[PDB]
Design a protein around this motif. Sequence first.
Motif, PDB file in Angstrom:
ATOM      1  N   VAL A 172       0.863  -1.175   0.000  1.00 51.23           N
ATOM      2  CA  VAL A 172       0.000   0.000   0.000  1.00 51.23           C
ATOM      3  C   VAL A 172       0.900   1.226   0.000  1.00 51.23           C
ATOM      4  O   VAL A 172       1.612   1.479   0.980  1.00 51.23           O
ATOM      5  N   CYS A 173       0.867   1.989  -1.089  1.00 52.12           N
ATOM      6  CA  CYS A 173       1.697   3.180  -1.234  1.00 52.12           C
ATOM      7  C   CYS A 173       0.806   4.411  -1.285  1.00 52.12           C
ATOM      8  O   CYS A 173       0.210   4.703  -2.333  1.00 52.12           O
ATOM      9  N   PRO A 174       0.674   5.161  -0.192  1.00 53.41           N
ATOM     10  CA  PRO A 174      -0.235   6.311  -0.183  1.00 53.41           C
ATOM     11  C   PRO A 174       0.450   7.599  -0.608  1.00 53.41           C
ATOM     12  O   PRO A 174       1.605   7.868  -0.272  1.00 53.41           O
ATOM     13  N   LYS A 175      -0.288   8.406  -1.372  1.00 52.19           N
ATOM     14  CA  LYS A 175       0.225   9.711  -1.768  1.00 52.19           C
ATOM     15  C   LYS A 175       0.397  10.622  -0.560  1.00 52.19           C
ATOM     16  O   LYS A 175       1.395  11.346  -0.457  1.00 52.19           O
ATOM     17  N   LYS A 176      -0.560  10.599   0.366  1.00 48.10           N
ATOM     18  CA  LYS A 176      -0.480  11.403   1.576  1.00 48.10           C
ATOM     19  C   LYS A 176      -1.230  10.693   2.695  1.00 48.10           C
ATOM     20  O   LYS A 176      -2.123   9.878   2.452  1.00 48.10           O
ATOM     21  N   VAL A 177      -0.862  11.024   3.929  1.00 47.71           N
ATOM     22  CA  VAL A 177      -1.464  10.441   5.123  1.00 47.71           C
ATOM     23  C   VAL A 177      -2.077  11.562   5.947  1.00 47.71           C
ATOM     24  O   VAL A 177      -1.416  12.569   6.223  1.00 47.71           O
ATOM     25  N   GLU A 178      -3.335  11.387   6.337  1.00 49.38           N
ATOM     26  CA  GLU A 178      -4.048  12.350   7.160  1.00 49.38           C
ATOM     27  C   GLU A 178      -4.065  11.897   8.616  1.00 49.38           C
ATOM     28  O   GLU A 178      -3.762  10.748   8.942  1.00 49.38           O
ATOM     29  N   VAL A 179      -4.427  12.823   9.498  1.00 47.55           N
ATOM     30  CA  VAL A 179      -4.533  12.541  10.923  1.00 47.55           C
ATOM     31  C   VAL A 179      -5.958  12.828  11.374  1.00 47.55           C
ATOM     32  O   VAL A 179      -6.671  13.639  10.774  1.00 47.55           O
ATOM     33  N   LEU A 180      -6.379  12.133  12.427  1.00 52.14           N
ATOM     34  CA  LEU A 180      -7.695  12.322  13.030  1.00 52.14           C
ATOM     35  C   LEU A 180      -7.517  12.355  14.542  1.00 52.14           C
ATOM     36  O   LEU A 180      -7.076  11.368  15.138  1.00 52.14           O
ATOM     37  N   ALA A 181      -7.818  13.502  15.157  1.00 51.78           N
ATOM     38  CA  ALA A 181      -7.402  13.691  16.540  1.00 51.78           C
ATOM     39  C   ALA A 181      -8.422  14.445  17.390  1.00 51.78           C
ATOM     40  O   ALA A 181      -8.036  15.094  18.368  1.00 51.78           O
ATOM     41  N   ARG A 182      -9.713  14.379  17.056  1.00 57.38           N
ATOM     42  CA  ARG A 182     -10.757  14.942  17.921  1.00 57.38           C
ATOM     43  C   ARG A 182     -10.518  16.438  18.161  1.00 57.38           C
ATOM     44  O   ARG A 182     -10.116  16.877  19.237  1.00 57.38           O
ATOM     45  N   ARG A 183     -10.752  17.212  17.102  1.00 56.26           N
ATOM     46  CA  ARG A 183     -10.287  18.591  16.982  1.00 56.26           C
ATOM     47  C   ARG A 183     -11.097  19.598  17.806  1.00 56.26           C
ATOM     48  O   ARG A 183     -11.096  20.781  17.449  1.00 56.26           O
ATOM     49  N   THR A 184     -11.826  19.156  18.832  1.00 50.44           N
ATOM     50  CA  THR A 184     -12.481  19.967  19.863  1.00 50.44           C
ATOM     51  C   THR A 184     -13.469  20.990  19.309  1.00 50.44           C
ATOM     52  O   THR A 184     -13.981  21.822  20.068  1.00 50.44           O
TER      53      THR A 184
END
Lengths: 157, 166, 247
Positions: free
Chosen positions: A137-149
């Motif tokens: 699996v080669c992703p172009k970009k990786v996102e984050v998910l962190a409960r942005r309040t």
Amino acid sequence: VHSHGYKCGTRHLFAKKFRKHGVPSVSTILTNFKVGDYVDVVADAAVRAGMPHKYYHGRTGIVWNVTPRGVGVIINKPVRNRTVRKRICVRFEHVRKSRCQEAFKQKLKDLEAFRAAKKAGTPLPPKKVSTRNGGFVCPKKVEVLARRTADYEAMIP
Amino acid sequence: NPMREIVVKKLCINICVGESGDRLTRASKVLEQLCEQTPVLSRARLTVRTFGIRRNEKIAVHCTVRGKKAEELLEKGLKVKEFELKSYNFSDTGSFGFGISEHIDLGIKYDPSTGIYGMDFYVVLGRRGERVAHRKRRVSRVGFNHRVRKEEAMKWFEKVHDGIIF
Amino acid sequence: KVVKNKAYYKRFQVKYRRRREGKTDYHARRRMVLQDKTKFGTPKYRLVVRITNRDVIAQIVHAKVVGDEVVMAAYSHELPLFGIEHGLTNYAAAYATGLLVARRMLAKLGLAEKFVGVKEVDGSYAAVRTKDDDQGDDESRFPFKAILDVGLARTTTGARVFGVLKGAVDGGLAVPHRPNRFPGYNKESDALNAKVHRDRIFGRHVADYLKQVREEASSNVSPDDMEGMYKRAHAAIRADPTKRRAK
RNA sequence: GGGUACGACCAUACUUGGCCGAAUGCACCAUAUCCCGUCCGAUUUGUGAAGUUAAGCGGCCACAGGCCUCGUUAGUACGGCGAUCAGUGAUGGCGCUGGAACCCGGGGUGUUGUACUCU
RNA sequence: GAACACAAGCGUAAAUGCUUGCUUGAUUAACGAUUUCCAGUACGAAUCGAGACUGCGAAAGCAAGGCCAGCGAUCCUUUGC
RNA sequence: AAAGCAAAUGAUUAGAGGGACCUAUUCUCAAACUUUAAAUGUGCAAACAACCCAGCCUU
Ligand SMILES: [Mg+2]
Ligand SMILES: [Mg+2]
Ligand SMILES: [Mg+2]
Ligand SMILES: [Mg+2]
Ligand SMILES: [Mg+2]
Ligand SMILES: [Mg+2]
Ligand SMILES: [Mg+2]
Ligand SMILES: [Mg+2]
Ligand SMILES: [Mg+2]
């Protein structure tokens, strides 16, 4: 005082659908039935003649007898610790042809075609590959998910 | 267009008397005389103590006329009313009517037995081709612009014979 | 007060397409296509007769789920190919077009040599031999069968739709019927006048009216031979039913 | 590119208004001797071609209503199974899991069978 | 949104509603089979058939009551064939 | 169950645009209301006393 008449609970069961009232169409009249077929039993509620009892609504069985304007169907029904084969007589408007065996029949035809292709040397279609195995699996970009309040203020009506 | 003109379809005469006895019988004779055509009786619907009538009891007698006789009968009525009408006599449908009080004035020899009655005249006007809304097969609606409206009705009236007071 | 508001359109259920156009009576259609379930979809044929302002149409139709299938249609506007070029909408024309379709159907089925039907034209009921009405014997070959369909037409004594029926019956087709609607029928004595029926078949009444019209034209093409080509047209139709106008 | 007859599914096909409509046809349309039926040939029935696309019919359009479809509402409401779980209670969240509805937004506005046919 | 004898529910628009015309399928129907309650007994009601003679229809067709509540064993009396 | 009344039936609060009235909205509801509509359910099928393919006999 509940009363046990022939139709004692059929207010919503024997009612037509919204914007779908009327009498049976021509395609229903030209169905044709044969002994040994599988049929579904569903009341039409616009043809009072030959209507089955409410228990047999939405049940599937095998036809055993054909008359000029009627069909006889065999249906299983459990009683105490056994199941009884009941025979009911209905008009042809309250029965539909069942598609409960079309998957089985299609599989048999496919197997027959498999044998014919092998014996005639015809190339066979390629096998499907399961996706439950591994891989890269080669992703172009990786996102984050962190409960942005901002969601905490969001769930306030 | 040649067939966009306005013609008179039918003229309906109605006599609304009470009771169901000799008064009704004589009125029928008078109507069939002036109409030279068999009339028909009508029966009530409800029962009213104030009007003293019961349900489905003979009350009125009427008839409808089409053709030349309709035209000449209409002329006689307008002559009695000197070709003078009022603004509130034409409906937005495209029809109008009036009423004479004494059946003598139309030019009928009085008879001491029948007596004197009053009548109602109603005239319906429309263009040619309305049958689309009356035929048994493939019934449809007449077009909006093809329909007859109130303003054209009085204009038709003044054309043949004027005398409308607003 | 407005009744045709937004809620009115939400709950409205439209009727069948051919009912909105006022073309098909589905109450009579359902009973016409119905057949016994013991017969497992054996063909059943209809005789559709329609009359316009200028033409008469006779068709033989078999009903299917995908759509009705039409076999051997005939129209009254092909009559000039045989020698009838006037009227084309009277009782005489209706008889001729019914005869033409019956012969065409029989020829296509290859049975025209048998089942020739009657040749001398007269108004007589006789009877139709079907499977349910053996009329005595039941071992001889049964005639081809069809049922008459008139649609929304009004059924009255002397109607032209029954003129098409009489032509088809005399052509050889087996259509069940009774003489109660033929023009010569009298209901009080429940009897049928052969002379009256045959007169209208050959257009006697039209000739008398045409003759009288000429007389009143005086002091304000020719009759007496209508039976002439009407009989000649019948022989021509019985000879070559398949001939048509090609282009 | 179309017409008529008989249809299947039965609103993407319905309702309102506007505009246009080459031909075949379909119509409106003329009239009551005969068949037939009406209070009235209005409807219905029988016989013709005098006129006309006016209407019906077909096609197109409308920040048009309705209808159909896809998103959003929303992993929200609700639910099956579990706890010597929280709470005085009313009730609630958690763990393993299933999962909506209207409003709203984008798009669309009949498909098709047999026969005889016109360009 | 009316009506369909009556309680309520379901159903129905060139109709299952209204008017009218003609009629007696409210008869007989060889102990055919089946559903409902249910012990898979009886009684009541109802469904699909076969045969006779008919009614209304030009025909396809519909009808052996008014759809589903409105009723009754042994013994005894009495009638029909 | 949920949802809706800006959709039919029933109940119901208040302003606005043209004292009743009309139009479009608006607060709040339903065991004997409903266009829509779950989870948990429930009927049938998943082969040999069978299914195909071919030719044949009988009514
Ligand atoms: Mg319930
Ligand atoms: Mg239901
Ligand atoms: Mg009919
Ligand atoms: Mg435990
Ligand atoms: Mg009827
Ligand atoms: Mg009863
Ligand atoms: Mg019988
Ligand atoms: Mg019954
Ligand atoms: Mg609730």
